[PDB]
Amino acid sequence: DHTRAQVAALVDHTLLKPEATPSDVTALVDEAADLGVFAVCVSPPLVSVAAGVAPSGLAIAAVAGFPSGKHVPGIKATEAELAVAAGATEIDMVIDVGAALAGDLDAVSADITAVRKAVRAATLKVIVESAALLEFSGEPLLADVCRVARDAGADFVKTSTGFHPSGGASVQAVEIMARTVGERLGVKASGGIRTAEQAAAMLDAGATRLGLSGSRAVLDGFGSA
Amino acid sequence: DHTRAQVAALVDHTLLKPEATPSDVTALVDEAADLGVFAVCVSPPLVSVAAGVAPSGLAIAAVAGFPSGKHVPGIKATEAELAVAAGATEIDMVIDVGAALAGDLDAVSADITAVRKAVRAATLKVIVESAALLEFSGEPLLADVCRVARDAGADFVKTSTGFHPSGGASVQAVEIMARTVGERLGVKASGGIRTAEQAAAMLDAGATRLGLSGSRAVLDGFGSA
Ligand SMILES: [N+]
């Protein structure tokens, strides 16, 4: 039910390590192009490097407020703006997870709205940090945060930063997200997706985009180049 | 050679988890007050909560560009400025570690300089991510980043975010930092300091400030309140 080419067409091939250099990013783009993936995803200061080498047809995503989500709205929004100016066409922003856990959904809304309005032409993905929302609160909060993101104009909800100790994507989280907002928003599964078996599980749960760092190993699990 | 009171007077009592709430920060401030520490350190969106309950004498540190360091200079500087407006008196910024590893020390300098100029009256600490500089390059790079921080006007160098897989403070790192800039700059040891024995090792190596999250257990190892 999943060919390598189909999967590749929904992969964001990602490098977000603090120690990443320009050479690491040009190597990421070369790998992304070789694998035929949808996008590369990089940190804000490295967008320009990615944009300078990406072929037409490889999208560029940047993260905003990442990984912690602990930035005021105006900073997230300006970071997003600057990344789009540098060549990103998609932004993956992190919510203030603590605001969500505190029940301050009006603050979560305001944050997403600030970013949305700063990058109105971009594809905006909202990282909800689902493993943390599920661990520290539960399913209702995860569903509610997804509704907040929808109502604030996000294009996607996304599971995870890959940096939080509660973990990454789970089938349970993706199913909740897809059932809550999947009729209107994309669902990006990310964090800890290392194998084709895992990727397939996420796609079957309702993911429409995958965020991978080891994309070649995942894709090889679906078939040969 | 260290009394409890002396150690407390150089502790920054810290909470930086993504899931931190306002009430978590109010509790942090109360604990810091009870322990008689120098400062509390919190994330930018939580500075005003901390400032709103901090007793007389307690300094407030905010992180900037944290934890990844992967933010453009204009964002780090504006984040710092906003945190000072919210009540911070100190800023602990993170360098772009990848820029340092690429040999782009001019970029590192420009980043520190931008923050320095935006918060001229604050105490500025520069997190060098010493465990990563040592792992991926070595001692000369650590010393050179300290020289850059000094020349860009920083008040302190600081070992670690506590979030990087390379690790936290080490005696080796503190000794290099102290040798390089300790006659002019403070040296803050942070990341993984859980016990009095570890804290004392860092102080003996040349640290003049400690970043702790479990400050009571450290202080109780030195003696009674
Ligand atoms: N000094």
Tab-separated table of N, CA, C and O in Angstrom, chain A residues 17 30 43 46-47 70 76 82-83 143-144 146 211:
chain	number	residue	atom	x	y	z
A	17	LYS	N	20.451	19.686	14.249
A	17	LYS	CA	21.420	19.661	15.348
A	17	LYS	C	22.009	21.046	15.586
A	17	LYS	O	22.395	21.752	14.643
A	30	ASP	N	21.953	17.582	-0.961
A	30	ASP	CA	22.357	16.558	-1.936
A	30	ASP	C	21.677	15.210	-1.674
A	30	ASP	O	21.233	14.539	-2.585
A	43	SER	N	17.435	24.654	10.273
A	43	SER	CA	17.314	25.696	11.226
A	43	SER	C	17.367	27.079	10.578
A	43	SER	O	17.971	27.278	9.523
A	46	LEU	N	20.415	28.595	8.677
A	46	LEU	CA	20.940	27.778	7.604
A	46	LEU	C	20.004	27.728	6.407
A	46	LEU	O	20.313	27.124	5.375
A	47	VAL	N	18.883	28.439	6.459
A	47	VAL	CA	17.945	28.506	5.345
A	47	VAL	C	18.590	29.024	4.100
A	47	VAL	O	18.392	28.486	2.998
A	70	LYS	N	9.647	28.060	23.877
A	70	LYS	CA	9.692	29.075	24.946
A	70	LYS	C	10.274	30.361	24.427
A	70	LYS	O	11.381	30.778	24.745
A	76	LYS	N	8.695	34.386	17.747
A	76	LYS	CA	8.381	33.328	16.814
A	76	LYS	C	7.964	33.844	15.471
A	76	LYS	O	8.358	33.316	14.431
A	82	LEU	N	11.657	36.023	8.899
A	82	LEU	CA	13.026	36.075	8.408
A	82	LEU	C	13.407	34.819	7.643
A	82	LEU	O	14.138	34.878	6.643
A	83	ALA	N	12.913	33.678	8.079
A	83	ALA	CA	13.205	32.419	7.402
A	83	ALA	C	12.557	32.373	6.049
A	83	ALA	O	13.174	31.905	5.079
A	143	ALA	N	-6.341	17.069	21.540
A	143	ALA	CA	-7.390	17.394	20.602
A	143	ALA	C	-7.668	18.892	20.595
A	143	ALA	O	-7.815	19.509	19.542
A	144	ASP	N	-7.791	19.494	21.770
A	144	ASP	CA	-8.057	20.911	21.889
A	144	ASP	C	-6.987	21.763	21.281
A	144	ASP	O	-7.279	22.748	20.625
A	146	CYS	N	-5.033	20.901	18.841
A	146	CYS	CA	-5.208	20.795	17.387
A	146	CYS	C	-6.324	21.688	16.871
A	146	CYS	O	-6.155	22.319	15.825
A	211	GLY	N	8.436	13.724	8.989
A	211	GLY	CA	9.673	14.386	9.249
A	211	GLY	C	10.714	13.372	9.659
A	211	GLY	O	10.520	12.701	10.653
